[PDB]
């Protein structure tokens, strides 16, 4: 059973998500793979330019989770 | 860095956003009744938030030293930058994208009943293989094992494993259908949720040989009645159960 321990929601510029603050004590705190993040997230945003990217990560009670990316905020593209 | 602290969620801060981002914000963490907008340093502001200054911790080695290996007596699951000095057989995990790290009490049980019971050379099916951590197991105990995932984002990621434990299971997409033709097997492991278990118990009959064994877990304490009641349904014999916490494991006689 995929238990979910955390929704995280963050808003980070595409491919600039590191290690450091918001990612790292967010993914952190609940003992999921901060680089592994960063480098998922980095490549699947990596040809977004500029754009603001809504992030949800979902935390599973084994450390694991997954993300899932949003549409350029409402205002931004507005 | 500096980090801007505001009362409200992302969706009801949204139209303010964009100036924190102009202003110079790195990224936004959605907290409890507050967004926390992150800068290399103060700016004047008009918002009204609250500016503070919270240095700048290496997150990275904070998550390594907090995360231990994982002991599932005969196994260790380690990941990839642990040491271990013991007998136990190691595992080595990249804690990652798939549910297997080896830090569940689920996995935990299916990896000591696979101990139980897999005979050296036996045909194993790990239905659900996420990480592939019980395939993996299942070869490291000279079994020869083959993982199923409806999942496929999990497979490149259990292929992924099985090359740093030196091992080849073969893993496929699909489920206990999929999983057919390349049976029956001697032992299945799955660790699932009760509904589905319920639901597969006569399918469960079809890929096992005579004699063979089923190891079901991912059953909450309370619901494990309704496996019970679906295994009996399909002629399966009781063996032991095992638990961990809230968790338990049934073993099933073909
Ligand atoms: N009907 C189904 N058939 C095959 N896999 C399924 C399934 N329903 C869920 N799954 C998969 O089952 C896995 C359960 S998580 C368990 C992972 C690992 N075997 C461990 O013991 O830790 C998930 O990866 C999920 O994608
Ligand atoms: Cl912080």
């Known amino acids: 059973m995929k238990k979910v321990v955390a929704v995280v929601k963050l808003q980070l510029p595409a491919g600039a998500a590191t290690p450091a603050p918001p990612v790292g004590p967010a993914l ?18 990596a040809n977004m330019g500029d754009a603001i990217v809504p992030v949800e990560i979902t935390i599973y009670a084994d450390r694991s989770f997954t993300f899932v990316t949003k549409t350029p905020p409402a205002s931004y593209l507005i | 860095m500096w980090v801007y602290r505001l009362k409200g969620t992302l969706e009801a801060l949204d139209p303010i956003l964009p100036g924190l981002f102009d202003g110079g914000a790195r990224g936004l963490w959605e907290r409890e009744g507050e967004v926390w907008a992150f800068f290399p340093a103060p700016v004047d502001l008009p918002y009204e938030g609250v500016w503070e200054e919270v240095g700048d911790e290496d997150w990275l080695e904070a998550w390594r030293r907090d995360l231990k290996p994982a002991l599932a007596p005969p196994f260790v699951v380690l990941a990839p930058w642990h040491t271990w000095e013991g007998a136990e057989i190691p595992l080595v995990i990249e804690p990652g994208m798939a549910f297997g790290t080896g830090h569940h009490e689920t996995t935990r049980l299916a990896l000591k009943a696979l101990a139980r019971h ?70 299945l492991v799955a660790n699932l949720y009760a509904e589905l278990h319920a639901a597969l118990a006569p399918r469960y009959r079809e890929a096992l040989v005579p004699g063979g064994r089923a190891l ?36 099933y006689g073909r």
């Open chain 1, 28 to 45: 952190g705190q609940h003992g999921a793979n901060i680089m592994e993040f960063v480098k998922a997230f980095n490549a699947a945003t």
């Open chain 2, 216 to 251: 079901l877990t991912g059953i909450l304490k309370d619901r494990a009645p309704l496996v019970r009641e679906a295994m009996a349904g399909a002629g399966f014999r009781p063996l032991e159960e095992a638990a961990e916490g809230e968790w338990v494991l049934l073993a």
């Open chain 2, 118 to 187: 897999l005979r050296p050379g036996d045909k194993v099916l790990d239905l659900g293989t996420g990480s592939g951590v019980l395939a993996i197991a299942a070869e490291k105990l000279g079994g020869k094992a083959l993982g199923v995932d409806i999942d496929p984002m999990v497979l490149p990621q259990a292929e992924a494993n099985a090359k740093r434990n030196g091992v080849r299971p073969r893993f496929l997409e699909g489920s206990l259908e999929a999983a057919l033709p390349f049976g029956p097997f001697d032992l």
